[PDB]
């Protein structure tokens, strides 16, 4: 039943989140963006005047309702310099409100679509993502939605992983996952073929994000999502537009990400040692790429 399923779920969440209403300490709720699960606002801490982000998600308007536990749990258990800080989670009416840090630098998509990144900047982003993924993969947690949209920046050029709503977990008992979850263009071929998959799907997705940072778009981006998925399924791994300008350490790096067989694909822990990541620039080198500085 709909009621039995909803009410029980709301009550479970109520216990999982913090009690009360964040409006008791927050002013100026203003929408700044929308996603898949819900909308995102900025708010003001009444006492200090400091800005925070608030993600509001309707319980009644989710495809897989149970995935909303991720929105709270992941940022709780996995505090990391490359992971978005979560302060509090609340239940307001039929909505889940997650209070987290505001990333003033915006999404990586904003940069990737407008300007071209040098290898120093690309390596900085890759290192940040992989450091975050290695901690997650070590605990069997798969992100499942790695893309430039899921990557956020500070004003000083630091890089953080976001959007943990699609996370699944694997363990000794649950070796692989089977669910079709993620964004079509970034999806791994084994996941599209509906085969049992592990954390290796994030590694492939990262490779697609590398193609983003170099070329501006994922492969088959002009194609319809459903049609483009079958293309990733049947074809050989996608290549960069022109390799004449890219360094061999970047080629070598991407060759470890975009492997069709997940068993031959490199793990996050392995890639953290790859020579390409040593070119990673300081946070300062990322700053010129941002909106205010274009």
């Amino acid at each position: 039943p709909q009621r039995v399923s909803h009410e029980q779920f709301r009550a479970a969440l109520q216990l999982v989140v913090d009690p009360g209403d964040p409006r008791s300490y927050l002013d100026n709720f203003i929408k700044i963006g929308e996603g898949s699960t819900g909308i995102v606002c900025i708010a003001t801490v009444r006492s200090s005047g400091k800005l925070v982000a608030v993600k509001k998600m309707d319980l009644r308007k989710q495809q897989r309702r149970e995935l909303l536990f991720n929105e709270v749990v992941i940022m709780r258990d996995y505090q990391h310099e490359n992971v978005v800080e979560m302060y509090n989670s609340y239940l307001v009416g039929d909505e889940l409100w997650v209070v987290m840090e505001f990333l003033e630098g915006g999404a990586l998509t904003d940069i990737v679509t407008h300007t071209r990144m040098n290898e120093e900047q690309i390596a900085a982003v890759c290192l940040a993502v992989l450091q975050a993924l290695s901690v997650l993969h070590a605990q069997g947690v798969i992100h499942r939605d790695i893309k430039s949209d899921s990557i956020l920046l500070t004003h000083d050029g630091r890089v953080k992983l976001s959007d943990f709503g699609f996370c699944a977990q694997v363990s000794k008992e649950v070796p692989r996952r089977k669910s079709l979850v993620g964004t079509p263009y970034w999806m791994a071929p084994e996941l599209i073929s509906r085969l049992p998959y592990g954390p290796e799907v994030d590694i492939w997705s990262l490779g697609i994000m590398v193609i983003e940072m170099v070329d501006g778009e994922p492969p088959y981006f002009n194609e319809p999502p459903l049609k483009a998925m079958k293309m990733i399924r049947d074809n050989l791994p996608p290549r960069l537009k022109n390799l004449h300008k890219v360094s061999p350490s970047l080629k070598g790096f991407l060759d470890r990400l975009l492997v069709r067989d997940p068993a031959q694909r490199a793990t996050a822990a392995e890639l953290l040692k790859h020579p390409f990541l040593a070119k990673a620039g300081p946070p300062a080198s990322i700053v010129p790429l941002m909106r205010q500085n274009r």
Binding site: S36, Q63, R64, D145, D149, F166, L180, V181, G182, T183
Partner: peptide, 7 residues
């Protein structure tokens, strides 16, 4: 921007 797929 493309939207994610579930199920």
């Amino acid at each position: 921007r493309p939207k994610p797929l579930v199920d």
